[PDB]
Amino acid sequence: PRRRVAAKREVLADPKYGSQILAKFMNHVMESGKKAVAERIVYGALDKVKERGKADPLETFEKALDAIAPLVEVKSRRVGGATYQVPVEVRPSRRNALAMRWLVDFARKRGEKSMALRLAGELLDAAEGKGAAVKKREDVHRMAEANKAFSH
Amino acid sequence: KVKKTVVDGIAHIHASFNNTIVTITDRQGNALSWATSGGSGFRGSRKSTPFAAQVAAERAGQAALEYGLKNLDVNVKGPGPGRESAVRALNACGYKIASITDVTPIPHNGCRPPKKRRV
Amino acid sequence: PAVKVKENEPFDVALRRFKRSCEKAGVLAEVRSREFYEKPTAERKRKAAAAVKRHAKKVQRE
RNA sequence: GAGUACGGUAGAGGGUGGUGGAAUUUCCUGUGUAGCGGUGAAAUGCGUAGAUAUAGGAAGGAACACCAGUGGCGAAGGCGACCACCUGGACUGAUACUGACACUGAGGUGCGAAAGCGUGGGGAGCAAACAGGAUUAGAUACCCUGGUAGUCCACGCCGUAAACGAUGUCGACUAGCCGUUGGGAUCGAUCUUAGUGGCGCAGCUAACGCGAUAAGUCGACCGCCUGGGGAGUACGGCCGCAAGGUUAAAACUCAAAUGAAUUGACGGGGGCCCGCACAAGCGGUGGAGCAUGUGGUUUAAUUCGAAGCAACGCGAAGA
Ligand SMILES: [Mg+2]
Ligand SMILES: [Mg+2]
Ligand SMILES: [Mg+2]
Ligand SMILES: [Mg+2]
Ligand SMILES: [Mg+2]
Ligand SMILES: [Mg+2]
Ligand SMILES: [Mg+2]
Ligand SMILES: [Mg+2]
Ligand SMILES: [Mg+2]
Ligand SMILES: [Mg+2]
Ligand SMILES: [Mg+2]
Ligand SMILES: [Mg+2]
Ligand SMILES: [Mg+2]
Ligand SMILES: [Mg+2]
Ligand SMILES: [Mg+2]
Ligand SMILES: [Mg+2]
Ligand SMILES: [Mg+2]
Ligand SMILES: [Mg+2]
Ligand SMILES: [Mg+2]
Ligand SMILES: [Mg+2]
Ligand SMILES: [Mg+2]
Ligand SMILES: [Mg+2]
Ligand SMILES: [Mg+2]
Ligand SMILES: [Mg+2]
Ligand SMILES: [Mg+2]
């Protein structure tokens, strides 16, 4: 917006865990206002993570997002006759949004019985990085060096 | 298969509007190796950026390190971008800078330049 | 267009010294002026425009 | 008024020879390798037959950065490396001298950018024509890679340009302010001259604007104009080797053509600002089945109307 007066609302309504990132992930996985459905699906996924993963699931969650967040992002700018791309450092707030969106959209595309164990599967895969979300993250990362020439 | 040693050579930059060419020779002006932004995989629009100039300069310096060359006298010629990129990039290979010179040929009156471009 | 190195200062002060020397030499202007032939009519036109701009600046100084 | 004699300044004023440095190109040689060049992106082209970069050498041609300036000189066109020789004019100071010897000028006489023409030379860069590669619906162009005449010199011709200050030459008067070139005089200041610029009062002008470098107030002489096209064309004459130049009509046709300024609109002109306009996101249409409207076809009728956004689940909130 040209005016830049649009402030942001603050949401923090963690039911039991009392965290922050969890609720934003809730909103990301919430579809068509099905908040309770998102509750039960993500909590079943986290239960599977907790039974599979020895440690608590929240630090595993944040470590998984640590391996999906892209450090730099490429963005096309047209020089006026040619279609270029420019690498830029990602906004610190934007990193979490990209992390959450990528993780959800990649957990959606597994194809197994439900997306609770899909979310668990990519949560453990992203915990060190053998998933597909990390594949897209590293591809986008390497595009920056592929286009480091312009940068400025 | 022969090998020869040399110390305190000269590195040369040809920085035109489309390209930059970095070469290494001895004090007698005999080439040892050379690097060009074209051969590094840049091909035109990317060929002009100072980053490619830095890459070519550091590649040439690394190739020069085999013969030693503890000292380097550097000439730069041409108005292209990267006129200063190579100067900084050469130290990345660990070279002693002894003299930086600009040898751009300035015609006094000379021949006449080509016709103006109508764009 | 040429500067010496001496007394182990960091390799940035000498860089700015070289940049300043090059821009005092005006090498870029002259090398740009030789890219294409400028017919004399355009040369006198440019000089007249520069003259009128300079005189307008000097008059507007008061 | 005009001119002569005598000292001193400034200047790319003209002509003839000689000499400089830089840079380009070509050729030869040395190490060294796989790319160079070019573009909006490419390609043509050049490449281990060793390029570009780089080092050394050789030949040849042309233009004279920095000084450089609203700067200077010349009747105009025009004239920038340095040196010598030949030469024209202007500016400045005092005295003497000639004593109207002046101004303009139809005819005529010359000088006159660039391109072009003839004979003989030369030829590096550039570059009409031309060849190829792109772009494009086409591209006999713009762009890229090459490239001949020409651009350079000597002699001769050609007589043209937005050859412009779009303002003929000569002379005398009319408020002022700020620069500047190159000379004097007075005590950095002042005064005065010949140029060269920017504002501006009266005055002039259709307006723009000019305004001591008038487009103001007046004199002397000359050149030119009489609606737009046809047409600066035809015919004749005179010039030119040719290209062509100069002088210069008519029939016919139209009711306009034109200058300056004003309001708006527009622009692949400029500057600020706004809007789910982009950007950042979420969910869709376009694919399938069905509902509903419209176009078209058929029919006896498919009853009328609505037609870019601003018609098409619209008049119709019920065939
Ligand atoms: Mg070119
Ligand atoms: Mg060579
Ligand atoms: Mg007369
Ligand atoms: Mg006459
Ligand atoms: Mg005459
Ligand atoms: Mg000529
Ligand atoms: Mg000839
Ligand atoms: Mg000839
Ligand atoms: Mg061409
Ligand atoms: Mg001919
Ligand atoms: Mg005429
Ligand atoms: Mg003229
Ligand atoms: Mg006239
Ligand atoms: Mg007068
Ligand atoms: Mg005025
Ligand atoms: Mg009048
Ligand atoms: Mg008539
Ligand atoms: Mg005629
Ligand atoms: Mg005739
Ligand atoms: Mg407008
Ligand atoms: Mg959008
Ligand atoms: Mg459909
Ligand atoms: Mg359909
Ligand atoms: Mg109907
Ligand atoms: Mg509706």
Side-chain angles (χ1 to χ4, degrees), chain A, chain B residues 1-108 110-119, chain C:
Chain A
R2 309 191 198 270
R3 299 291 179 90
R4 179 66 179 86
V5 75
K8 300 305 291 185
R9 82 189 65 77
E10 179 161 353
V11 298
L12 265 192
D14 205 321
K16 56 190 179 83
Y17 270 25
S19 175
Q20 296 175 353
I21 280 169
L22 183 63
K24 192 63 69 71
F25 197 91
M26 294 299 291
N27 293 168
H28 282 80
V29 76
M30 182 179 72
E31 190 277 331
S32 170
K34 303 291 184 67
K35 185 164 269 296
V37 164
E39 294 293 328
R40 51 188 182 88
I41 301 299
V42 69
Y43 279 152
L46 210 66
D47 275 337
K48 180 176 179 178
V49 170
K50 181 69 176 177
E51 61 86 20
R52 210 60 47 86
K54 280 200 170 184
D56 264 333
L58 73 164
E59 69 275 16
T60 295
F61 189 82
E62 61 86 20
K63 278 196 290 184
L65 282 71
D66 281 334
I68 190 168
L71 275 165
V72 293
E73 164 67 277
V74 68
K75 171 183 56 171
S76 285
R77 209 269 313 275
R78 193 172 182 281
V79 71
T83 304
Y84 286 171
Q85 308 156 4
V86 168
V88 295
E89 182 65 26
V90 187
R91 184 167 62 237
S93 178
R94 205 174 146 79
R95 324 182 49 74
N96 278 120
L98 276 296
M100 293 180 183
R101 189 184 316 143
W102 277 349
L103 188 153
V104 174
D105 202 359
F106 271 107
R108 285 162 179 284
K109 65 179 73 174
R110 266 267 187 82
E112 62 196 8
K113 292 185 184 297
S114 71
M115 72 291 291
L117 78 172
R118 294 178 181 117
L119 188 153
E122 279 79 344
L123 183 62
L124 277 296
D125 276 357
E128 62 86 20
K130 65 178 72 66
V134 286
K135 180 67 174 66
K136 203 169 98 81
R137 165 205 192 266
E138 61 86 20
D139 190 314
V140 177
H141 179 268
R142 188 269 299 164
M143 214 49 45
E145 293 83 3
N147 283 190
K148 186 186 282 287
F150 320 109
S151 64
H152 307 317
Chain B
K1 299 294 286 288
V2 298
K3 294 181 176 67
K4 67 191 194 306
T5 177
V6 72
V7 174
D8 180 35
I10 62 170
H12 284 177
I13 301 299
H14 191 40
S16 66
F17 285 118
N18 293 115
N19 205 332
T20 179
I21 297 169
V22 64
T23 79
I24 55 170
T25 70
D26 50 358
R27 275 301 309 274
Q28 311 318 108
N30 284 298
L32 301 172
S33 169
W34 52 271
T36 49
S37 301
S40 299
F42 285 82
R43 283 296 97 201
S45 167
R46 302 175 181 83
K47 185 183 287 185
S48 300
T49 187
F51 167 70
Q54 157 163 265
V55 162
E58 64 92 20
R59 169 184 303 204
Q62 288 165 1
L65 276 170
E66 181 178 358
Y67 304 78
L69 289 172
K70 313 303 185 290
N71 301 321
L72 258 185
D73 270 334
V74 294
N75 297 115
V76 298
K77 182 174 72 68
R83 168 197 176 94
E84 61 86 20
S85 160
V87 169
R88 272 192 280 94
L90 268 185
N91 269 22
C93 313
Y95 281 107
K96 163 164 269 296
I97 291 315
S99 167
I100 61 171
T101 84
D102 198 28
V103 287
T104 59
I106 294 178
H108 284 70
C111 300
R112 65 196 270 146
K115 68 159 76 154
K116 180 174 215 215
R117 279 175 98 236
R118 274 191 312 278
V119 295
Chain C
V3 65
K4 300 289 95 175
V5 291
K6 49 163 189 282
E7 270 80 34
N8 54 49
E9 289 82 3
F11 189 32
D12 282 334
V13 187
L15 209 55
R16 272 187 59 247
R17 288 162 76 228
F18 175 79
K19 284 271 202 63
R20 210 86 185 185
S21 89
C22 279
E23 63 90 6
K24 299 289 94 175
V27 172
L28 277 301
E30 322 285 319
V31 65
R32 276 209 279 94
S33 179
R34 307 270 193 278
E35 299 177 21
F36 66 100
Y37 182 37
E38 193 192 11
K39 297 166 203 243
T41 61
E43 190 276 331
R44 283 82 58 85
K45 263 170 85 52
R46 186 169 47 81
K47 298 293 183 182
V52 65
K53 184 177 180 180
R54 174 196 317 133
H55 179 259
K57 192 97 167 301
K58 184 49 182 176
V59 169
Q60 199 58 258
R61 277 283 85 75
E62 272 78 11

